[PDB]
Amino acid sequence: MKTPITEAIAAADTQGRFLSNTELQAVNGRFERAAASMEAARALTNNAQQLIDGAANAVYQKFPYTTQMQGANFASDSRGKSKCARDIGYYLRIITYSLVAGGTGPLDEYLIAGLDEINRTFDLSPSWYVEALKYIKANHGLSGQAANEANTYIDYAINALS
Amino acid sequence: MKTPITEAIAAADTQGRFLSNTELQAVNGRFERAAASMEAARALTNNAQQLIDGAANAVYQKFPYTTQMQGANFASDSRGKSKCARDIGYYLRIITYSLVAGGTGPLDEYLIAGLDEINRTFDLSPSWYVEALKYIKANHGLSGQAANEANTYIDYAINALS
Amino acid sequence: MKTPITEAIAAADTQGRFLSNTELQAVNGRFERAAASMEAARALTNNAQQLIDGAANAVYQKFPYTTQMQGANFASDSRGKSKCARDIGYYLRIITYSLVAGGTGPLDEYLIAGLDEINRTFDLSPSWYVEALKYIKANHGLSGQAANEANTYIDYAINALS
Amino acid sequence: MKTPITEAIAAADTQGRFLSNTELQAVNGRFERAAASMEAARALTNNAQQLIDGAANAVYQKFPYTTQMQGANFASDSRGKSKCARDIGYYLRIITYSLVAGGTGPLDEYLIAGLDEINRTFDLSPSWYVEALKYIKANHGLSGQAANEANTYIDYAINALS
Amino acid sequence: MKTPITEAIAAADTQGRFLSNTELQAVNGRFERAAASMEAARALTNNAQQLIDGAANAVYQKFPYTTQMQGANFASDSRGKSKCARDIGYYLRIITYSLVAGGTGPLDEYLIAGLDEINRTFDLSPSWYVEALKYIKANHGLSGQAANEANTYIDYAINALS
Amino acid sequence: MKTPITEAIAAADTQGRFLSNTELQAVNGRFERAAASMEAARALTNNAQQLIDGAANAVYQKFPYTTQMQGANFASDSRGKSKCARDIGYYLRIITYSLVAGGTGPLDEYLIAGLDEINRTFDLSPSWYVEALKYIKANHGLSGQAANEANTYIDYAINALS
Amino acid sequence: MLDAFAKVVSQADTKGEFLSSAQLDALSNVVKDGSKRLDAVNRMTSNASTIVANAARSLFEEQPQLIQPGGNAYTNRRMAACLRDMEIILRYVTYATLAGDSSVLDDRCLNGLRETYQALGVPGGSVAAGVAKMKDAAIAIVNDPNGITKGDCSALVSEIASYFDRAAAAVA
Amino acid sequence: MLDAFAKVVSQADTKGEFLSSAQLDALSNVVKDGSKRLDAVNRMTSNASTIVANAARSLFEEQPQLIQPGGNAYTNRRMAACLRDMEIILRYVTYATLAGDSSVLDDRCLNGLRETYQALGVPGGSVAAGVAKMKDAAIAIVNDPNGITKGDCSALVSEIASYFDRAAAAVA
Amino acid sequence: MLDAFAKVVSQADTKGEFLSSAQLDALSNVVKDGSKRLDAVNRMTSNASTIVANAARSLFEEQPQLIQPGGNAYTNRRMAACLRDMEIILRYVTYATLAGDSSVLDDRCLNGLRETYQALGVPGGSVAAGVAKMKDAAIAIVNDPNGITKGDCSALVSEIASYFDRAAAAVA
Amino acid sequence: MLDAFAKVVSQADTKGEFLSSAQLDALSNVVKDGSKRLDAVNRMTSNASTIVANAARSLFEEQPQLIQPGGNAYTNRRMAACLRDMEIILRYVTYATLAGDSSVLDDRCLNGLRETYQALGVPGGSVAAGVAKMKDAAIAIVNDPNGITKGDCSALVSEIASYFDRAAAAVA
Amino acid sequence: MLDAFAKVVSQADTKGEFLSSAQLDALSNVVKDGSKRLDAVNRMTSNASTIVANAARSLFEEQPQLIQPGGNAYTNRRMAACLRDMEIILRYVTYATLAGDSSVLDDRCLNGLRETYQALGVPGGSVAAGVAKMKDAAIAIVNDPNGITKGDCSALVSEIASYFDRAAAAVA
Amino acid sequence: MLDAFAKVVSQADTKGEFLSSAQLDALSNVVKDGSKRLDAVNRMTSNASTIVANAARSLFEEQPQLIQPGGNAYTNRRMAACLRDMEIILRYVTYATLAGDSSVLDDRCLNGLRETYQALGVPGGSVAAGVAKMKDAAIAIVNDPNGITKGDCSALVSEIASYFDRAAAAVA
Ligand SMILES: *[C@H](C)[C@H]1/C(=C/c2[nH]c(/C=C3N=C(/C=C4\NC(=O)C(CC)=C4C)C(C)=C\3CCC(=O)O)c(CCC(=O)O)c2C)NC(=O)[C@@H]1C
């Protein structure tokens, strides 16, 4: 999986050479950022259920037609609400994985790869998930470098959707 | 030239994507190491002439035949001594360049690329330069991370020669 | 542009051979289908404005939020309605082009190539155009092979969107 | 084997797409030509032995040296006459196969591929077979599109030999 | 042009190396064979017209139909006889060129390359030229290594035709 | 292994053709040179031990530091002298192999391939072996083409080292 | 690959004889029934997307262990791969229907698929269930009598069902 | 490349308007006259070998300086190249005749041919003479009234002659 | 490509002398101001999509002749190409901002772009207008004082504006 | 390949749950001990050449049948190949030490090495002896207390020895 | 590949000793008899076409089931392939005759031929019969005493027959 | 490429006539003087390394501005490139000497070298000086009378000097 350490090792391996000072400097920078990364990860994991419920409710309020239109891809019944809550939980959990791993490897591997085809096939709108992620970014309750890291990963996900 | 910033930019460019968090972390690690890098560079630049003279003298003492054998590739006359001093100065200056730039880019580009062919063609021994570099490492008079960086680059050069 | 005649000529040219009986048979089949193709093209061209207005109105009735939500990509104002009418006119005109040319060349070249990126960037939903095309198919007022051809091309466009 | 249906299927498969309207039009054109194709095939099959004997006799009359010169590749004895009759029968049978299949697939696969090397190795003249095919074309006794198809395939074979 | 010296030079050049002892040995072997090569070349050049006339006459006697059949590719008139004499002269002259150059370079470059297509297009039989070359080999009047070289090149030409 | 016969066979095989006159001429040149080759091989094999001892002694006299400096790569003890004698014996034996085989195949395969890496890793000087080979060339006691061949192969080895 | 005409020609050439009257009559009958085959292929091609989407939705409702965390279809990448495989199977079934012979389907799609799935770890039973659902949907769409000339298509539907069952048995 | 239908569609799309009744009527007329075009293409394809051989023989009889020692067609290799070029020109003329538009002929064959011949040293006048002889032979074969339904093909013959003259002028 | 450190090292090696104290002090100052550069690059990368979309919308509102039938951006393919080009220009501007030197931007993006656009027929004035709009949006986003430590970024903003104007002048 | 963070994330995703506090604490401990790992990697990389040369010399002194005429290391080419293999093994051990997990070493170096050596005829026991000598030299160099901050590196040395023994057992 | 000189040198290097007098005398004898080998190779190369044609004709007369409809040589393509294979076998026999060692013949031609023929379905007995006929023809041509210096070539003919029988046994 | 025999054959074929007695006598004279050419080529090949090294040393002593910091030969890479170029020029001179014609030297080495050096910035005068020094060294080595049969080699030396001067003039 794409992490800074594995990226440096792969870069060194494709050339058949030992590890230079640049790879060690990159690993050291990752270790320096790890403190804020773990702070953000703990803050996001501790309040997962409240964030999921709030993001779902925000999606339901901004797009009220998603709870009234009769369809398989809408949340007009309990099955649709369960699917939406599951999707938001998946998004939050994978964002936490990316925060812990120190890179966008989990985001690219588990969620982004193949997202457009799924959204087209099952008739889902990226705007719903963009609104949910915007709520999560506005209400994660962090400050400083931890907030900076969380916002960076949330914006990466949003730019992937948009 | 191969520097951490240009390496990260090239890695991002070969994939046609924006700069991720890993490249920024690598650049931050380079910036953290820059303090020791500049300390070592200043210490090596301030005492360049004394180090060059001492390294030359050490080479002359360890291999006494280099000052008595009659040949074009030996230092038995003033021309050979001038050439040896020039070579040691080149080695020290390029090591300083590598220390400042933050990577082995200057070392690979200006000195290492094509070294074996030159040593074979003009009948020069890598052991002389290894001894000079060992003297420089033993007598640069640094302590701590600056000494660590200087020793790392000197060992890179030595491993290139050996 | 991808037409049956040009497709046959390109197939013959990539092998460096003359035109065989199979290419002539394909061209003859195209000529046999041309009667129904032109019938459908005339029927669709004669009632273009009514079809465009009806398809727009159907989109507005099925998705009522597209006329009330405040946004740049919605038809809540005159500019959005003009853009929607222009889009539906483009769809109908390119379908007519494909009917006349005898293949999906115009559809693949003018509309389908790059459709997903545009829909993602400008935040447009393929379901609106699917509903408009469904209305057009239900209300083009043809019968027989002309209706068969028109429905075939409309379904090709719909499958491209879905 | 190269038939219009298999050609269309292969063209669709090399691009990883479904069958478009052009392939169906080509298959329909093949089906329209199939009537004349089968008419010509029946007419050529019903009078096979007479055509073979006549074509052989025409070759023997136009090149009288083929029945007097002493050689392994000449028809001066019973073995050579048997070989010539067998060759003419092969030509007629493969032409019938091509007429039935709707393309030059059987002709390219069973007869044309490797014909020049065989004619050079065993010292055979293409002019003999050209004369036999010309007799067959002049005496197959067809009229209309069936005659057109038979002449087209015979001319394809002749151009292959010439 | 393909000569032993140029072949050795090209072999040395494709590897980017100097000329080794093997290339010099090959050139020396060519120089040793050059005596017989020039002997055969002189013997064939001195009696060119008689050999050409005899080979033509042999072709006319073995295939008597070539002087009676009415056609553009036959020697039934003065134009055909002139063309046949010109062809036999070309064959003999190029064989002499190959003998002088020390290899089959002239034969492959001037005559063999494209021979089959010409023989098929203009309806010429390789057996005529095979008979002419057989007469030339039987009546060149050489003995020893010169005869060996002449026979080797004539057999190379014959195998090219057959 | 690279010998003139195998080189000619490989050249003929990469083009899928029979053996031409040029390959036979090259083999004949090799056979003509074989007499001097075997003469030189016998002369070098008969006096192997004396040549090895003399070349070793010449190396020890020209570079006297190789018998006094304390090191693993020097001949200051019995082990180093045994290693040097073994190396000189290897050089002479492989030169004899190359003389017998008629090409530089044994020299390129057994000795030259990978020589620079070994000399760099184990800290050996090519000048020692150059001096030994120069002594061998000056004291092999041959005259004529045998001496020419021996000198050619010794110079090939020297140019490989230099 | 081989269609009906190529198959008959190949057998006749292997036996080395002219085509008889029975074979020519059978080929004439095959040619006479080409319009129904073209209609079936066109309808399946037009409704492919809905067929695939509905079949996938039904399959994931019947076997919920595939989309659970840790399943074989739990990611966007693996879900896209599953949809792509189902679309490929439907496409090759349509190719075989147009050709009139299952040579292309057996040679280019079903050749060595079971071993590939075993190496990857893909459950073949779920794939067979999805293929059966696609078969039912496609057969129901083909036999739609609205907006088409009335006729007999029983043999064509039976043959299409045969291709679908062959694919399901070869992948299971 | 573009044929008549593609050309009309391209102009209509560039102007951004639906096709009018005149353009549709012209395209219907083009479709109605397709059998004659198919016959012309079939006849030219069938007689291509004889056309090329006769044209080459006539060209080398009219200009004997080409096959003389030192000429541009004095070898087997160069003679084969000349025959190949003439066959290629005839093939592309047939392609343009089938398409109904000279886009393919101008884009894939005649684009940059004069400069290539100038660099190689090939005389363009002899090539133009050979093209004219091929044109005459092909036109004579196309207008053969034996074993075909009687009709009017004057426009088709004029168009084919136009393509041949265009090729001759572009290569000269 | 070259950044500041590589540029200084290259000039010093060309002159063949050790680095002086002034150059080392300048490089130390460059290192000391790296956090602001990282923040600017991060903000531009995060807001790239909105920047590009808003700039394209504004450009097509100001110059309506581009999206009209027959325009240079009238298709889905050409519109996608235009958006891709704008995104590429923004990406290379971000690369140059991170490097601290415009070598990569001038060597990999702006080298020979005017001739390519002239050959294709792309109007350079509209591209320059779009680049200016992107510059304004990016500069406004970078100088946002919300949720960040207060400081002085005037030199960084001036340098970024210099890169944007260089790109606009090189493409016009 | 996988390091510690990637391994933990992969197991958590397979089980489909958030990371607990124990895993986060373990990862924090791993991050806290990164300086020692960087020092170990740097020292091994710096002394690689001497390690390889000394190990090869010792191996050829202990088993003299390898460099004898007819041995598996009797040429310059085969000796260079042996040195290259030892250097590759050391390089991959350093990669695994930096990663903190033996996934890369087992996947890119030791995967199918025994079969390759068996096919070539390379004795695995001598390779194992050389690997053991390299292990001893590298461990002795890593634990050098001169010119470094005093601390505890027992776990790191044990882990490095584990990687070396794993390589030796996988190649034997 | 290896010839006699390379073989002797390889064995001497494997044993690690200088060549003795017996080996040098044997190599001198091999060199002394090179003219006969060159004559044999030249004659076989010159008569290759007639050898192959006559052998193929005789083989198809002796076993008429190969050229019957349905046979393994019933087409122009398969007949050309059979002639090509026979020519390749003769060419490699000539290569081995020139080299003086059957290494090239066993390594480049006969290595894995039986399995290839078994997979394709080619009968090996007919190939062996054709090889035997080619052997007889080539031997008869080589021993022709007309227009050549009289001498003893018994060993050369025996060796050539050995190569031919080796090929026949390896392909059967 | 062309040697003397190929050149004469090419002119004779262009004129389309048999070779006369004068040309055959000239070719016989060329063949008679082959041993001296082989000796010259062998000596130059054997002494190439010393020739190149001495010429480079002399050139860098005469023009010290090349190896100064900032020069065109101030690095290990550029010095290696310069030595490689000189070795290539000597190698092609030896090729031309063996061939007896300067076609290969003019076609594969000196074709477009001046423009390449102008684009790169390599001074041609220094290259010409190095070529002249190599010429002097090679001529002095070739005319060494020790350990060789006494004879006349004046024409060969003049021709070699002509090739060297041609290279020097073409590179300047
Ligand atoms: C059987 C699956 C269903 C069915 C089909 C059916 N159609 C006819 C009539 C026609 N179908 C076509 C369709 C095409 N011909 C082509 O070339 C192409 C591709 C370019 C298509 C799509 C045509 C032209 C006809 C004839 C004209 C007409 O409209 O009638 C029949 C009758 C038998 C026949 O062969 O024509 C049948 C059975 N109808 C059903 O009810 C079945 C469900």
Side-chain angles (χ1 to χ4, degrees), chain C residues 4 15 37 42 45 54 70 97 107 121 131-132 140-143:
Chain C
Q15 314 185 299
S37 281
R42 293 182 186 271
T45 309
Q70 258 338 337
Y97 289 167
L107 263 177
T121 292
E131 179 51 51
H140 60 78
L142 276 161
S143 185

Side-chain angles (χ1 to χ4, degrees), chain C residues 29 32-33 144-145 148-149 152, chain D residues 20-29 31-32, chain G residues 31-43 141-154 156-157 160:
Chain C
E32 308 285 300
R33 198 66 162 171
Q145 300 303 314
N148 192 0
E149 285 272 304
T152 288
Chain D
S20 54
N21 198 2
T22 70
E23 289 85 3
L24 304 193
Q25 282 170 344
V27 176
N28 183 56
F31 285 157
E32 308 286 300
Chain G
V31 168
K32 187 197 63 90
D33 282 272
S35 285
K36 319 180 190 179
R37 198 173 307 268
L38 292 183
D39 282 329
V41 171
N42 190 25
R43 283 179 157 180
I141 297 169
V142 159
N143 275 329
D144 194 318
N146 283 349
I148 203 168
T149 316
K150 184 95 164 66
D152 188 271
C153 296
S154 288
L156 201 52
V157 182
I160 295 171

